[PDB]
Design a protein around this ligand. Structure first.
Ligand SMILES: [Mg+2]
Ligand SMILES: [Mg+2]
Ligand SMILES: [Mg+2]
Ligand SMILES: [Mg+2]
Ligand SMILES: [Mg+2]
Ligand SMILES: [Mg+2]
Ligand SMILES: [Mg+2]
Ligand SMILES: [Mg+2]
Ligand SMILES: [Mg+2]
Ligand SMILES: [Mg+2]
Ligand SMILES: [Mg+2]
Ligand SMILES: [Mg+2]
Ligand SMILES: [Mg+2]
Ligand SMILES: [Mg+2]
Ligand SMILES: [Mg+2]
Ligand SMILES: [Mg+2]
Ligand SMILES: [Mg+2]
Ligand SMILES: [Mg+2]
Ligand SMILES: [Mg+2]
Ligand SMILES: [Mg+2]
Ligand SMILES: [Mg+2]
Ligand SMILES: [Mg+2]
Lengths: 195, 153, 148, 50, 129, 109
RNA sequence: AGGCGGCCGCCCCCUCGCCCGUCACGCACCGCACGUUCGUGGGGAACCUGGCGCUAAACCAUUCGUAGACGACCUGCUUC
RNA sequence: AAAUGGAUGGCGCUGGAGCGUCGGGCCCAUACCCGGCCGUCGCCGGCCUACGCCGCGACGAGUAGGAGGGCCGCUGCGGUGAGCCUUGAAGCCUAGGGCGCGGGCCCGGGUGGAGCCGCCGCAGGUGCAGAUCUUGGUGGUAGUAGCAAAUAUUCAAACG
């Protein structure tokens, strides 16, 4: 059904390729933590290309024409727009199925986030090559919401710690229960047939 | 004679017609669309308000270059105009339909206007006198008007 | 906007602001809201709203209006204003606002003399005017057919 | 081309979306910033040009 | 269950569109009958993809399934009793079809003679009282 | 009780770059992601389940609003493990990005 | 961009709420598909019943000028 | 280093989705092979409309142009159907059924009220999408421009 994807440590084009392929099949995919999506190359080059993209505008009326979003979620949504056939009611329905968010929403705090191995910085890039941060680029050009998103991100990280301590306590309790006795009769079946 | 959209029964229905009457076809079409779907006393009070310029007729289809008015907001529309002569002729044919319902013997206080129809009659031509000695037509646009009324139950 | 908490005794000028036709209106605004003020069980559901207001908000704006009875005007409608309190912490800002509900704020209380304070308003209506009066462009000479 | 007398441009592009404002009371687009060092005060009042 | 003719296979027509004329949609002075365009720049004559198709020899139906009604007979029109009784020998493959200008008084006699001779008529219950 | 059909997503038609061929359809079937994995599904029969407001149904007890265009698997397609299929009637092209059942009959278990 | 989860004290009750063994039946519809699902699916018009309640507001008209080509905007209308 | 903002097609891409060398798979064109159907040509069969009936094989694109066929069509003429009918002909309409590849045709349903068609031959003022085509009618424009040269009208009553 829903595919909640991490954005921490992913690449823009690779993640956009996998999302734009999997959204045409019907799986409702949502890319969360979009401010952490890395872009290869130099950061001066990335902001120079984005400055050229801002320079591209209609001269007779800039409103009727090129729109230039500054938020990184809308940057990734434009990246998936430029790959889906959005002028037809296949890519238009796919962009209606696609949802993108900066930070993490409260349902996606609770729901588990997936990590795509094919789009990772470590898998795809040589570790001695330069990179950038899409949230850093967005804060440098236009998107003035880094200080609020980072504060709410630290808040949900504190929430995640105070949940993970309870989860690890319950895991220690259930492994004490597994350490206890009189469960091995089924384990004679299970260890033979793939414990 | 025949009428388009014959009613459910001729017992509880009256009918009226005007033929070859000097009006504007577009104004009579728009005031007929403003009339249609209304009780007969409300339509009579509405046409009196049109002749007194207290409640307008919205122009929806034939709406080219027509100035706005504040009174069109009852109709959910922006443009409007107050056809005096069209309101007078259609009120006269509503009085004729009222008299025909009285002749047929209906409950005359509970009639609604189920069907109305307006179409272009044969027009009469005069001539203008434009520049360079040229003659251009100056043509009318009369209309045939039909209406089928129905009791409300 | 987290939630808006109004006062108890709301003036007739504010009611004329909330309504369009004061003659046709039956003057029925805030009857149930004043009932929520009057009821004892409604106070606990109202003081809890300030407890959440102390916790989650940072920008608190106080709504104020004008007394039209002290004016020689004819409008008799009180214009509402959100005024952002730029004071200290949210707790004492909320305590200040709840202490000074339904009270008057003079200009000598907040402002002062020789304080450089900007003015925001709406310009005059000059109507649908032309180009040389709007953009102050240069006029064409006398010999110009079709417009100067 | 080569206009031969370069003139400064009439008007301003920053005031270009000219419209009868839907509000008639001039609203505040941006209030000044806050800090807990300053005491509690207000920022904006109403007035009438007498 | 009327007369049940002989072995008639799955009748195919290889396309069933009765091809439209080019730009008959745009102008209502143009009848929908086909007419071969002989223009020097026309996309239909040049046979571009996405355009209309021209009727040629390839759309010919099979000779076994040629002039075949979906009931399984081949039609033959009839005016009177002699042209009905000429179908006495081949009534199991060739059906009758009464002409439009035949009145009801003779039409009932023709359909009664067809019911006696076991000849299929395409319009048995038409123009009756 | 329980699902007996494998899940497949209708991906598109057999096409080049410009023109299409609507007689053969493409199915991205779940689980299969390899040429060696799209071997067991050779010979399966597919079914596209859709809805309509009239009543043309199976004899399964009661009439409903369910209509199915039938068909079956023809062959494999690509190295990614896609499945070609020729249905008895061609696809309505509304089924793009939707689901077609693959039921586990006549294959060679 | 929140609505389900956790604790305490009782309630109409249940010790077959689950795995291992014995027993007998329920449509066994006699070769066939769309069957079993989060569905007490989304919203729209009405039908009869229980309790708790609700008793208005826009637009036109008129006036006003801080506004106006026409629309549009800001306004007044109580019997003190 | 060049003038509107813009082009490996764009999105993007750096352990490649760049570069050069290559391996195995994979995708399709009206190309190839097999098969079903139509037509042409060639060779041929039979003493079954001989101008008909089969059999085999290879081939089909095309402006200007040239031929063959048309049981495509319109008007009229002579033979011809013991033709059609006021119990409804020509004409016109049709979300009806069908045929032929196509020219077109047949039937059903609705108005109409007096002429019409099929085969074989014969003769044409014989087929329209154009020609700033001719005649006639009708839309968008459009309830738009325009009812502005020469100082000015106002109140009451009357026939109506
Ligand atoms: Mg216009
Ligand atoms: Mg106008
Ligand atoms: Mg003149
Ligand atoms: Mg003015
Ligand atoms: Mg001049
Ligand atoms: Mg702002
Ligand atoms: Mg050419
Ligand atoms: Mg580029
Ligand atoms: Mg390479
Ligand atoms: Mg050829
Ligand atoms: Mg003929
Ligand atoms: Mg000629
Ligand atoms: Mg002649
Ligand atoms: Mg013509
Ligand atoms: Mg031509
Ligand atoms: Mg011409
Ligand atoms: Mg004209
Ligand atoms: Mg005018
Ligand atoms: Mg004008
Ligand atoms: Mg004059
Ligand atoms: Mg008088
Ligand atoms: Mg009188």
């Amino acid at each position: 059904q829903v595919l909640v994807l991490d954005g921490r440590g992913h690449l823009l084009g690779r993640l956009a390729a996998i999302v734009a392929k999997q959204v045409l099949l019907g799986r409702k995919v949502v890319v969360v933590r979009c401010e952490g999506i890395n872009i290869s190359g130099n950061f001066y080059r990335n902001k120079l290309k984005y400055l050229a993209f801002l320079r591209k505008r209609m001269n007779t009326n800039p409103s009727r024409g090129p729109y230039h979003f500054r938020a990184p979620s809308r940057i990734f949504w434009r990246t998936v727009r430029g790959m889906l056939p959005h002028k037809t009611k296949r890519g238009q329905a796919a962009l209606d199925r696609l949802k993108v968010f900066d930070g993490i929403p409260p349902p996606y705090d609770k729901k588990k986030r997936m990590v795509v191995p094919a789009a990772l910085k470590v898998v795809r890039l040589k570790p001695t090559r330069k990179f950038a941060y899409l949230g850093r680029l967005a804060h440098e050009v236009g998107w003035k919401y880094q200080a609020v998103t980072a504060t709410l991100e630290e808040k949900r990280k504190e929430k995640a710690k105070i949940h993970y301590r309870k989860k690890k306590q319950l895991m220690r309790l259930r492994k004490q229960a597994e350490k206890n006795v009189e469960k091995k009769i089924d384990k004679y079946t299970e260890v033979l047939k793939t414990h | 004679v025949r009428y388009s959209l014959d009613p459910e029964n001729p017992t509880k229905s009256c009918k009226s017609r005007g033929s070859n009457l000097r009006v504007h076809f577009k104004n009579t079409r728009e005031t007929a669309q403003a009339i249609k779907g209304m009780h007969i006393r409300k339509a009579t009070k509405y046409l009196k308000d049109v002749t007194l310029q207290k409640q307008c007729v919205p122009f929806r289809r034939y709406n080219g270059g027509v100035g706005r008015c504040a009174q069109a907001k009852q109709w959910g529309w922006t443009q409007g105009r107050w056809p005096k002569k069209s309101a007078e002729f259609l009120l006269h044919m509503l009085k004729n339909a009222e008299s025909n319902a009285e002749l047929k013997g209906l409950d005359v206080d509970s009639l609604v206007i189920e069907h109305i129809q307006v179409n272009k009659a044969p027009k009469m031509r005069r001539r203008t006198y434009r520049a360079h000695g040229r003659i251009n037509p100056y043509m009318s646009s009369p209309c045939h008007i039909e209406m089928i009324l129905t009791e409300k139950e | 906007t987290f939630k808006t908490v109004f006062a108890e005794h709301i003036s007739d000028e504010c009611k004329r602001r909330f309504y369009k036709n004061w003659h046709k209106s039956k003057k029925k605004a805030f009857t149930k809201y004043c009932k929520k003020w009057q009821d004892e069980d409604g106070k606990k559901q109202l003081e809890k709203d300030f407890s959440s207001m102390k916790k989650y908000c940072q920008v608190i704006r106080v709504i104020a209006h004008t007394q039209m009875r002290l004016l020689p005007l004819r409008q008799k409608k009180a214009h509402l204003m959100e005024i952002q309190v730029n004071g200290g912490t949210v707790a004492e800002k909320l305590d200040w606002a709840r202490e000074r509900l339904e009270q008057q704020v003079p200009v000598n209380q907040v402002f002062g003399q020789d304080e450089m304070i900007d003015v925001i308003g709406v310009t005059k209506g000059k109507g649908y005017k032309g180009v040389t009066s709007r953009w102050h462009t240069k006029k064409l000479p006398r010999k110009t057919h079709r417009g100067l | 081309s080569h206009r031969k007398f370069s003139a400064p441009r009439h008007g301003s592009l920053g005031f270009l979306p000219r419209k009868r404002s839907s509000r008639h009371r001039g609203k505040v687009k941006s209030f000044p910033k806050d800090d807990p060092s300053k005491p509690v005060h207000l920022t904006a009042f109403l007035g009438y040009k007498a | 269950a009327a007369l049940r003719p002989l072995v008639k296979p799955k009748i195919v027509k290889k396309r069933t569109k009765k091809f439209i004329r080019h730009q008959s949609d745009r102008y209502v002075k143009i009848k929908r009958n086909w007419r071969k365009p002989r223009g020097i720049d026309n996309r239909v004559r040049r046979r571009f993809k996405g355009q209309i198709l021209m009727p040629n020899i390839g759309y010919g139906s099979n000779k076994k399934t040629k002039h075949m009604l979906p009931s399984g007979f081949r039609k033959f029109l009839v005016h009177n009793v002699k042209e009905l009784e000429v179908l006495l020998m081949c009534n199991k493959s060739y059906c009758a079809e009464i002409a439009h200008n035949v009145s009801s008084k003779n039409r009932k006699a023709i359909v009664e003679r067809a019911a006696q001779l076991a000849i299929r008529v395409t319009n048995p219950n038409a123009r009756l009282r | 009780s329980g699902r007996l059909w494998s899940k497949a997503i209708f991906a598109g038609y057999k096409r080049g770059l410009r023109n299409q061929r609507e007689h053969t359809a493409l199915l991205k079937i779940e689980g299969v992601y390899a040429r060696d994995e799209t071997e067991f599904y050779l010979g399966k029969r597919c079914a596209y389940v859709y809805k309509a407001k009239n009543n043309t149904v199976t004899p399964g007890g009661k009439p409903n609003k369910t209509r199915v265009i039938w068909g079956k698997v023809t062959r494999a397609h690509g190295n990614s493990g896609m499945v070609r299929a020729k249905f008895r009637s061609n696809l309505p092209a509304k089924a793009i990005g939707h689901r077609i059942r693959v039921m586990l009959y006549p294959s060679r278990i």
